[PDB]
Write a protein that binds this DNA or RNA. Sequence first.
DNA 1: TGGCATAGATATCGCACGTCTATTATCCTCAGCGCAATCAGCTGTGACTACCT
Length: 53
Amino acid sequence: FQAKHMDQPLPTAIGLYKNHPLYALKRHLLKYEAIYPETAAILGYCRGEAVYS
DNA sequence: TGGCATAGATATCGCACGTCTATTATCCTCAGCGCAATCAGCTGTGACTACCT
């Protein structure tokens, strides 16, 4: 099931990345949330925005 | 027959509305210091009495 889920390239809507464990966009990060490491792998690009786990 | 203007279906991000929890100061009340008019003991005054000449 995890392998099948990873087969999805990226959702079509930026809003789908909000508070999503597999999506986790940049703008949606809360006050206490930060990307570590800052050199993490990019899962994809949605409308110019990089996707991180 | 072939390329592109234009009408249809579908979301989509930005903007505003309803709601909550934070991680270290403020406010009544009592025992101990004061200020203002009587009253008793210290001090001053008058009289009793032993002592010296």
